[PDB]
Amino acid sequence: FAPAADPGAAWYLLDTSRSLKPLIYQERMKPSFTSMTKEDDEQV
Amino acid sequence: AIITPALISALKTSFQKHFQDALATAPSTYLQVATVIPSTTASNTYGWLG
Amino acid sequence: EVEGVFVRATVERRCRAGFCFDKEGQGFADGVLSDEQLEALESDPLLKVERCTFSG
Amino acid sequence: VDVYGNPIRTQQLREPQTSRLAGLAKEFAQHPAKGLTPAKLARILVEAEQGNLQAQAELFMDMEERDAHLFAEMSKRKRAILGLDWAVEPPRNASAAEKADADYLHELLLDLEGLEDLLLDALDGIGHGYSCIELEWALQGREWMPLAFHHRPQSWFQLNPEDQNELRLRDNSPAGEALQPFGWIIHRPRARSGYVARSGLFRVLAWPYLFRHYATSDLAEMLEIYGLPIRLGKYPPGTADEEKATLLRAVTGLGHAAAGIIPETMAIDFQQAAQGSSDPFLAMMRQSEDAISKAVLGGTLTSTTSQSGGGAFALGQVHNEVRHDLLASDARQLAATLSRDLLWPLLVLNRPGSPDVRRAPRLVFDLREQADITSMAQSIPALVNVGLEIPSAWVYDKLGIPQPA
Amino acid sequence: VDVYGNPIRTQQLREPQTSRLAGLAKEFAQHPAKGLTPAKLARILVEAEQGNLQAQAELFMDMEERDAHLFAEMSKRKRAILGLDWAVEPPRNASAAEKADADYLHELLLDLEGLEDLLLDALDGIGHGYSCIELEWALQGREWMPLAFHHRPQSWFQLNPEDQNELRLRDNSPAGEALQPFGWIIHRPRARSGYVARSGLFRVLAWPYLFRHYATSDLAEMLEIYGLPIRLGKYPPGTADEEKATLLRAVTGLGHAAAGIIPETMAIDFQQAAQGSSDPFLAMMRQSEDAISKAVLGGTLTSTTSQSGGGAFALGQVHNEVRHDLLASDARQLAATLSRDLLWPLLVLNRPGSPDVRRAPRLVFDLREQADITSMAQSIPALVNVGLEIPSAWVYDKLGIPQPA
């Protein structure tokens, strides 16, 4: 169906990920974007 | 934008030396099945009288 | 897929004959041909620019 | 409850507040100092004013690491505090119960490992404008104990959108998260009057750092170019590509090579490479370093050095103006922060009753200045023979000698 | 158990942790300092921030070896500590059993060979940011003994992917290996507040080292080029290859050779070789050396030297500010590390019972500063004739004279 046999104790781990940058939070609060003065009262 | 990001690949790319030497030999096994006989000659000979 | 499109009725410098005037042509962020001419043609926009997925 | 009156619940003390934010512990600094220009620095500062303290904190860390003079000044300033003896004193005209509480707190602080590290971590707020240290609370039976002190990076916090003086954790939400009571020791020294974002000393020191960095980099480049002159070769029409390459290699290696020969039809001209001096660069570096010294430690001993000269009153001359003032200010602010954050939870958890907040014991740093023993010892006998009844308590306190027991 | 509470099993103490990692002992340093550019240094530092400490450790070793000024400063700083007398003291108001335990530990440390080498190895963490010393545990009957102290290179460790403050061995696995309890003495002095990777002093000192290296290499090259001028020969059309070679050899040897003759149709032009001075290079070297001196030992005695000038208070003037602070900080941190790592296993293995961790004896370095005997000896008689009852214990302690026995 969807199998995979991998080692875990080796110096390398299969399918290695890459957390290049953290989970930075991007926000649209108030007088920081135009969505809220020259637009509706929208925030993303 | 940038005209040719094609040629600027060399400068951007970084190195991750994590796949270097990420392997090892099988665990030693001759100890269980074989015994060490230290010697200092060119052709060691064993003798038994039966 | 090609990433790069300008579909906000935006202005870009396209040169027809002896002058460069507002027009939307290539409008892509990737190039494989006409790079020297694209530079003059692909001058980044004057006005609001927004990109889409033509996937052509 | 705490000093600020916020209700205190012992249920939340079993786990750190940031434990449920495993995302923070996996982050890496972005190093915004590399490739920094005055416009970028201005944008960073302005954004920090608006509640984006992450970039400012990372820039401050890079600034601390990359400048040897600034790092030495800050380390000296902090080590000045770290070497001061401290004691816990009971409130004004305290009663027997209050004296016992103060004594128990003093004994607890003496036997609490990691105090020096806590002081060092707290003193980071001098430059960063605010330092947050997370507490680990544990129960060894019936008495709460601070298991350890964890210093959390300033990049982990932000400003409240509804309040510019209140810090909050970064929990992916616009408003962040309020700081748990009794879970932190927040130290916010106040060099200048204003909001928390603008209160750091590194905000003052940023521009001289950039000036020095630019001057040093330019000097390094100019030293690299120095040496041989730039020399340009010229060739006549009808010189093929191979001959062009040969001429180019000859010109390239001519500086290292003492001698060479070319056809009379060619020509090589040796033009000035870089002619000047290091005087402007070094002048800028000296100006920036003097500014940093004055801003950090005062313009009487570091930048405009007090020079040599001993004597009985030499200690006073060197210390009292500038050095004593700065030492006392830093020590008093640190002591106030500690008495507010660490002493109070211990008093209100480890002891029975609800003592009034105004009567809490206060941590005091020993700011006593060494007094000339010889001059004063000469002076007393005349005064006592005259008839003055000088108390012995004043003498014992001022000399540092303890009263007989 | 240990101070951190981790369970302790005496089975694993028979063999060193790294014994089963024979691969480590066969490695050789890669010497990343050779051919080092600012971009390479920045990449090395950034990678070290992310858990690749091998390159950073090797670079730091090369930096220590290749810079004479930096090496001299670090050696002087460490030898300052190595010369301090030390003692083991019992906890606050200790009981008879605690006093006996402290006395036995003191006797054991006195008779333990290799203590000075252990202190020297631990002090490497000042520059490297962390030093790990492996312990060899042996049983001479019923009492455990540290057989020897082995200093393992900083290149043998890494950072935990899930924790940036926890070090681990390099066992070919992504997560490394956790450090065995009671198997190491880890010394991590804290000059600046931050993670372990950023905590080294060599991280601050790296850039001045590179500046000085570039300046010195450029000066050496310019001194090599100095001397004779570059002179270029020109030949007319119709000069054969043999004549070209003869002209080239003549030009090549003309500088050493006082005289030579050429046809009127040829020409030799003597062009400037390298005209300038050593002033810019030497200015850069002096700037870098002053920065290193300030960062290592303070900007009051080394870089901006305190100059000469004796006197009774000259010792205090030279020491108390800067030198005493640095000495006390380093000594206290080393003593805390030792009391945590070496004293505790001895107490909990070599003696019966389970003494409370808060009551463990603490190693103390003798930071007593020489006090002026003559001035104070003049001072006492006046005070005692006045009527003050100064304790003799304070006098004996402060003068260094021992109490009568």
From TrEMBL, chain A:
<protein>
    <recommendedName>
        <fullName>Bacteriophage Mu GpT domain-containing protein</fullName>
    </recommendedName>
</protein>
From TrEMBL, chain C:
<feature type="disulfide bond">
    <location>
        <begin position="15"/>
        <end position="20"/>
    </location>
</feature>
<protein>
    <recommendedName>
        <fullName>Mu-like prophage FluMu N-terminal domain-containing protein</fullName>
    </recommendedName>
</protein>
UniProtKB/TrEMBL annotation, chains D, E:
<protein>
    <recommendedName>
        <fullName>Portal protein</fullName>
    </recommendedName>
</protein>
